[PDB]
Amino acid sequence: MLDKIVIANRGEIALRILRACKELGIKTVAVHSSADRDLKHVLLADETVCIGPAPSVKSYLNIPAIISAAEITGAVAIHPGYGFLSENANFAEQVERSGFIFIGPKAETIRLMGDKVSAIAAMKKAGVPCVPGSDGPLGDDMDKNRAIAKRIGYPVIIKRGMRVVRGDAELAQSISMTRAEAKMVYMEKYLENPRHVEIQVLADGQGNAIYLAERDCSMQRRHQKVVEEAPAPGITPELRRYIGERCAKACVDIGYRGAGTFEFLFENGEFYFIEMNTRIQVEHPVTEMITGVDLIKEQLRIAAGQPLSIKQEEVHVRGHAVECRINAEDPNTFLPSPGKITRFHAPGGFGVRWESHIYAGYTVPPYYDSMIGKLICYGENRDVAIARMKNALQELIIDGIKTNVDLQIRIMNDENFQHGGTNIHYLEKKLGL
Amino acid sequence: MLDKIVIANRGEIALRILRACKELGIKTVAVHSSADRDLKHVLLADETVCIGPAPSVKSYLNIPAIISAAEITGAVAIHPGYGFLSENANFAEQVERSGFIFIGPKAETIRLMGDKVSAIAAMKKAGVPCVPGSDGDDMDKNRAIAKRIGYPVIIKRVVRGDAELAQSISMTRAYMEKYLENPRHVEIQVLADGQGNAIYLAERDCSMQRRHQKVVEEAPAPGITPELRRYIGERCAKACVDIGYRGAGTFEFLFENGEFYFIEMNTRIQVEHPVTEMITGVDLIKEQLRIAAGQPLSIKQEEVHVRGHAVECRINAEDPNTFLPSPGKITRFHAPGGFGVRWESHIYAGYTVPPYYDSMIGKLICYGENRDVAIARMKNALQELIIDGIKTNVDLQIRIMNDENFQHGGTNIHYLEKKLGLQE
Numbered sequence: 001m002l003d004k005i006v007i008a009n010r011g012e013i014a015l016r017i018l019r020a021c022k023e024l025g026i027k028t029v030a031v032h033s034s035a036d037r038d039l040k041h042v043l044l045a046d047e048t049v050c051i052g053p054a055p056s057v058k059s060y061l062n063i064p065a066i067i068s069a070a071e072i073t074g075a076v077a078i079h080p081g082y083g084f085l086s087e088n089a090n091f092a093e094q095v096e097r098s099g100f101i102f103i104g105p106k107a108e109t110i111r112l113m114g115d116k117v118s119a120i121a122a123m124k125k126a127g128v129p130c131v132p133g134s135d136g137p138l139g140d141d142m143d144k145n146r147a148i149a150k151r152i153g154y155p156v157i158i159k160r161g162m163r164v165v166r167g168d169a170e171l172a173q174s175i176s177m178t179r180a181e182a183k184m185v186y187m188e189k190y191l192e193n194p195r196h197v198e199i200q201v202l203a204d205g206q207g208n209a210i211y212l213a214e215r216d217c218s219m220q221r222r223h224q225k226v227v228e229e230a231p232a233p234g235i236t237p238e239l240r241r242y243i244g245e246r247c248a249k250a251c252v253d254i255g256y257r258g259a260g261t262f263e264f265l266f267e268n269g270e271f272y273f274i275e276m277n278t279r280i281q282v283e284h285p286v287t288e289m290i291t292g293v294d295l296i297k298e299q300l301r302i303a304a305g306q307p308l309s310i311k312q313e314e315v316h317v318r319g320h321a322v323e324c325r326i327n328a329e330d331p332n333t334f335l336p337s338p339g340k341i342t343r344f345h346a347p348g349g350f351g352v353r354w355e356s357h358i359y360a361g362y363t364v365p366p367y368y369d370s371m372i373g374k375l376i377c378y379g380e381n382r383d384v385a386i387a388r389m390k391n392a393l394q395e396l397i398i399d400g401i402k403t404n405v406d407l408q409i410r411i412m413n414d415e416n417f418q419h420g421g422t423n424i425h426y427l428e429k430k431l432g433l
Numbered sequence: 434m435l436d437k438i439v440i441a442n443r444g445e446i447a448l449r450i451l452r453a454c455k456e457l458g459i460k461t462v463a464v465h466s467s468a469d470r471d472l473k474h475v476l477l478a479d480e481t482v483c484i485g486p487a488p489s490v491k492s493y494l495n496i497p498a499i500i501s502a503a504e505i506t507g508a509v510a511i512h513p514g515y516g517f518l519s520e521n522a523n524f525a526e527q528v529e530r531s532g533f534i535f536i537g538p539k540a541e542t543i544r545l546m547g548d549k550v551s552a553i554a555a556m557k558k559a560g561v562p563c564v565p566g567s568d569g570d571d572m573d574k575n576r577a578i579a580k581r582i583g584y585p586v587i588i589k590r591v592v593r594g595d596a597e598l599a600q601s602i603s604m605t606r607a608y609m610e611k612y613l614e615n616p617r618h619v620e621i622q623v624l625a626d627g628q629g630n631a632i633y634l635a636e637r638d639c640s641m642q643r644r645h646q647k648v649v650e651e652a653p654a655p656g657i658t659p660e661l662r663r664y665i666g667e668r669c670a671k672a673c674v675d676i677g678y679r680g681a682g683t684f685e686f687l688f689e690n691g692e693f694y695f696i697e698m699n700t701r702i703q704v705e706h707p708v709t710e711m712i713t714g715v716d717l718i719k720e721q722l723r724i725a726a727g728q729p730l731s732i733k734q735e736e737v738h739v740r741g742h743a744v745e746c747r748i749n750a751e752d753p754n755t756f757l758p759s760p761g762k763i764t765r766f767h768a769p770g771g772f773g774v775r776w777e778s779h780i781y782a783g784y785t786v787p788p789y790y791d792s793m794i795g796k797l798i799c800y801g802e803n804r805d806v807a808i809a810r811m812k813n814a815l816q817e818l819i820i821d822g823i824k825t826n827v828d829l830q831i832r833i834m835n836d837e838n839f840q841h842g843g844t845n846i847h848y849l850e851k852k853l854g855l856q857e
Contacts, residue, residue, distance in 0.1 A: 019771050022813050023806070044817070288772055292741075292802070319714075345781055346768055349452045350710055354770045360782055380714065387456045394455075395477070 002026050002077055002304050005103070006070045007041070009081025010060065012373060013282075015041040015357045017079055020296035029073045031066060033059035035365050040357035047073050054367050060084050063091055067098050077101035077303055083369075086279040089114065103303045104258050105278050112254065113276045123273050126250035128262070129243070131272045133188040142172055148187060155190040164190055193423045194267035196220070197232050199247045200287050202298055205257035208308040211244030212291050213317050215283055219411065221427050222334065227411060228283040228323045230290050232266075233382065233420040243271050248312075259284075259299050282325070282374070285355060289321035289378040320382045322389050324408040326356070328401045329370040336370035339363065342400035347392040351378040351385070364401055372398075382420065386412055434726050435459055435510050435534065439503045440474070442514030443493065445795060446704070448474035448779045450512055453718040462506045464499055466492035468787050473779035480506055487789045493517050496524055500531050510534035510725055516791075519701045520547065536725045538679045538700050539627075545676065546698050556695050559672030561684070562665075564694040567609035572599055578609060585612040615845050616689035618642070619654050621669045622709050624720055627679030630730035633666030634713050635739050637705055640846050641833065643756070648826075648849065649833055650705040650745040652712045654688075655804065655842035665693055670734075681706075681721050687846075704747070704796070707777060711743040711800045742804040744811050746830040748778070748795040750786050750823050760788035765821030769814040773800040773807070786823060797830075804842065808834055 004027035007017050014030070018041045021028050030045035035054040042048060049069040052059035059065070061084065070078060078095050080103060085091040092107035104110070113119045120130055132152040138145060146168055149156055155166045158178050165174050178185050196217045203209040214235060219227035231240075247262050259280045265272040284295045293310065301309065328337045344360040356373025358364075364372065377392055379385035390412050393405060414430070416422050427433075437460035440447050447463070451474040454461050463478035468487035475481060482502045485492040492498075496518065503511060511528055513519040513536065525540040537543070546552050556563055565582050576595055579586050586592045588605040591612060622634035638654035639647045653662075669684045681702050686693040706717045715732065723731060750759040766782040778795025780786070786794060797818065799810035812834045815827060833839055838848065850856045 016771075019813055023809050285772070294772060343782075346770070346776075348768070348776045348778070349449070350707070350716060350775065352775070353772065356770070359767055360765075384456070391452060391455050 002101075002300065004029060004047075004073060004075045006031060006066070006073070006075045006078045006100075007045070007081070008060075008066055008078050009084055009086075010036050010039060010041075010368070011357050012355060012371065013081040013280075014039070015044075016355060017041075017081065017296060018044055020294065020300065024297060024300055026300065027075075029069065029075050031069050033367075035059075035367060038362065040359060049073065054365075056084070056367065063094060066091075067094065067100075070095075070098070070100050075100065077103055079103040080279065082277075082279050082281060087114070087277070101303055103299060105256055105260065109255060109257070110278050113278055116275075119276065120273070122254060123250065126253050127246050128250050128273050129246070129264070129271045131189055131191070131265070134186050138175065138185045138187050145175065145187070146171055152187070152189045155192065157188050157190050159186045159188050189272075191265050191267050191272065193425065194265040194272075195232075195421070196263065196424055197235070197266040197271070198261050198263040199244060200284075200295075201247055201251055201256070201260050201262065202295075202302070202308060202310075203248075203251045203256040203258065203260070204302050204307045205255070206307050207252065209248040209251035209256065210308060210310055210312050210315060211247050212287055212293060212315055213240060213244075215286055217283065218422055218424050219417070219427050220424055221431070221433065225283065226325060226427065227408070227417075228286050228325075229382075229385075230286040230321050231317055239269070258302055259295055282371075283323060285353060285374065285376045286321045286323045289353070289376060290317055290319060291315055292318070319378055319380050320385045321376055321378045322382075322385045323374055323376045324389060324393065324412075325371055325404075326373040326375060326396075326398075326408070327370040327404045328364050328372050329404060331402060331407075334370075336364070336366060336368070337402040338366035339401040341398060343397060344399070345395070345397035347375065347395035349388070349392070351388050352376075352392055353378070358398070372403075383418075386418060435722065437462060437479075437506065437508045438510040438512055438536070438722075439464060439499070439506070439508045440478075440514065441493075441499055441511050442517055442519075443469050443472060443790070444779050445777060445793065446514045446702075447472065448477070449777060450474075450514060450718060451477055453716065453722065457719060457722060459722065460508075462502065462508050464502050466789075468789055471784065473781060482506065487787070489517070489790065496527060500527060500533075503531075503533050508533070510536055510722075512536040512721075513701070515702055515704060520699070522547065534725055536680070536721055538682065539677065542676060542678060543700050546700050552698065553695070555676055556672065559668075559675045561668055561672055561695050562686070562693045564613075564687075565611045572602070575602070575609070582609070582611050585614065586610065587612045611694070613687055613689050613694065615847070616687040616694075617654070617843070618685070618846050619657070619688040619693065620683050620685040621665055622706070622717075623669055623673055623678075623682050623684065624717075624724070624730065624732075625670075625673040625678040625680065625682070626724050626728075626730045627677065628729050629674065631670040631673035631678070632730060632732060632734050632737065633670045634709050634715060634717075634737060635662060635666070637708055639705060640844050641839075641849055642846055643849055643853070643855070647705065648747060649830070649839075650708050650747075651804070651807075652708040652743050653739055661691070680724055681717055704793075705745055707775065707796065707798050708743045708745045711775070711798065712739050712741060713737055714740075741800055741802050742807045743798060743800045744804075744807045746797045746811060746815070746833075747793055747826070748797060748818075748820075748830070749792040749826045750794050751792050751826060752824045753826060753829050758788065758792045759824040760786050761823040762786075763820060763822045765819055767817065767819035769797065769817035771810070771814070773810050774814050775799070780820075805840075808840060 006029045028045040029047040030042045031049050031051045051065040080086040089107045089110045092102050095102045200212040214232045215230045216232040217225045217228045261277040263274040340363040346354045353376040377388035439462045460479045462480045463475050464482045464484045466487050484498040518524040522540040522543045525535045528535040589608045590601040618640045621636045625631040636654050637652040639650045641649040683699045685696045762785045768776045775798035799807045801807035
């Protein structure tokens with residue numbers, strides 16, 4: 001197993017990673033910004049290295065600084081975490097060219113899924129369901145244009161008030177009208193009220209891949225996830241098998257290695273590929289609760305060249321989990337609201353999981369994002385899970401800053417949310433956004 | 434479910450019960466002493482009631498006061514919790530008679546099991562493995578029993594063979610019983626509804642003790658096979674029936690050489706119960722409430738599956754080198770977090786641990802696929818735990834987790850005292 005690793009990220013995730021390393025007997029190097037001196041994981045790592053000033057561009061984004069840190073400490077691999085350089089193909093290539101192991105997929109692969117086109121194209125071949133439409137451009141002949149629309153199913157759009165065709169009568173006009181807007185067009189199937197269901201995978205690089213059920217991330221605000229849960233309500237074992245197996249196959253055909261996620265749009269029992277995150281996600285714990293798999297350790301094994309420990313048959317969905325992201329932000333602008341936390345109290349109990357680096361007297365800096373933690377409650381059913389969350393949030397205390405707690409509470413209390421199956425627009429809708 | 438309930442307890446176990454109420458939609462009533470005003474669960478309760486000055490004698494033990502509290506609030510039931518009036522027949526008797534619901538078994542049952550003798554007797558009726566003995570000047574017969582018992586034996590002096598028989602008996606003379614030199618402390622968890630249903634929830638090992646007080650607990654118990662698991666469980670479940678047990682309870686046994694010897698039954702929820710919830714996924718507390726509301730047993734034996742392994746380190750405010758209670762003000766606190774980590778405690782930064790009550794302030798529970806994972810989580814977990822302003826057990830717990838012998842599993846009730854050098 002791996003000797004030492006560099007945790008190339010900060011906050012929450014960093015801490016998550018550290019714990020996982022410790023458990024595995026792996027030495028930790030913590031790279032930090034002068035401003036992240038007081039971070040919890042930093043305080044807990046084995047080695048430490050301040051890579052640069054406060055600003056991300058000069059610290060967390062500084063490849064060179066990062067690489068060298070690895071050279072000096074004599075670290076073998078690097079863990080990108082999520083959101084920084086996690087999906088930056090250079091870094092990846094660079095790390096490897098440098099003599100270190102990149103905890104994630106091949107740069108090649110990253111480049112591939114980096115552009116919709118190739119991604120989609122790759123997806124198509126692999127049998128991954130994508131949004132139907134017109135292969136090439138859309139011509140003059142109304143007979144076949146309309147045959148297309150039948151094929152794909154109204155409503156559809158043709159890619160000024162924006163316009164959605166709901167039937168034949170309108171087809172021709174909207175089509176022409178758009179061509180007129182130049183002085184070369186296409187038709188795409190319309191997804192009015194879809195849900196956001198993403199599939200979780202693991203691949204060893206040696207031919208093995210596995211799906212680990214799904215997650216519903218429909219509760220979003222400004223295209224940013226707020227609540228996440230697993231498994232996805234409404235999803236059947238059969239529907240789960242179908243898209244999971246398609247997903248794994250793809251993985252195989254693409255030489256995927258590590259953890260990855262496939263994000264789909266789900267409407268009327270159908271899936272439509274949106275994108276692949278070629279890294280672990282913030283929402284992973286939701287899945288860990290349900291399968292009992294530790295995504296992070298598994299990621300560490302793969303990197304070491306261990307193949308997949310798990311077989312699909314050993315993967316089992318049990319119970320239900322919900323996650324509430326917790327942020328320090330402006331209730332109106334949604335911007336981070338930096339400051340010193342005067343009082344903190346975490347919630348506890350059965351089925352309660354707290355993932356945060358914050359602490360009492362800890363100062364939230366303005367240079368980064370606003371997320372300060374995540375709360376995951378598990379339960380034998382959805383309902384139990386929701387109930388735990390209700391309480392947990394009630395027990396949670398964070399003074400000295402503006403949070404998001406109130407809204408989460410309000411969401412847990414939502415009629416429809418408790419009913420389940422809301423869509424990607426419900427949230428903004430209920431807020432007035 | 435029940436509407437409103439009284440939490441006839443405090444600290445840690447009080448907050449665990451509160452949370453279970455909330456989830457169910459049950460209103461809570463918290464009775465506290467003037468010295469537990471600031472308790473966590475107290476701050477979280479629906480309703481509150483001061484029942485007396487600090488000394489438990491006057492507060493937590495003040496029956497009449499407790500009873501009145503349920504009256505004025507309109508409460509329906511009372512949850513005794515653990516270690517107070519929890520195993521008090523009178524209390525149970527008066528509760529019921531005053532028209533309330535006692536969340537526990539029947540007073541009759543509490544007495545019946547509160548007697549070292551009466552119990553054994555009952556246990557022998559149900560057919561529960563008890564410690565073999567004389568069962569009631571001869572050196573001829575007297576030797577044959579011992580054969581039946583198996584050596585070693587003890588006259589209540591230790592005997593290993595016929596030889597030392599006389600000499601030892603003659604010194605004794607100046608009852609014979611089985612001698613368990615190196616046993617483990619294995620207890621079985623049960624749930625019964627009083628409506629004829631009874632289920633066992635595997636076992637736990639609490640061999641790790643000091644002054645006969647549990648320090649670390651785990652589940653399941655290492656070396657314990659399904660076959661054995663079943664044998665004993667079925668046995669304990671059966672007895673629940675004969676005795677008409679209602680509620681949660683535990684049968685504690687001494688384990689040695691593949692054999693179990695009954696010791697006792699705590700007619701109540703135990704401290705260590707969490708270790709079981711993790712391994713079977715059953716909320717022991719909610720069931721309790723359930724049974725008290727007149728519902729039947731929700732689970733079926735076949736539905737009881739043991740998965741993974743769990744460990745529990747009790748956290749106390751004592752001097753680790755003297756074991757002297759350590760009341761004081763916690764000035765810095767940080768709880769551990771993560772996957773498979775469970776923190777159960779009412780303490781909070783700025784909180785004052787009083788001298789009046791017991792020294793335990795929290796429990797730390799870790800889970801894994803393996804016992805190795807759980808121990809490994811424990812270790813990290815303890816590393817993250819921060820409690821400043823008072824003396825704690827931490828460091829000792831850390832030492833235990835690192836004990837080569839603990840990592841191996843199978844230790845006995847004596848290891849700890851030894852390891853520490855307290856046996857002297």
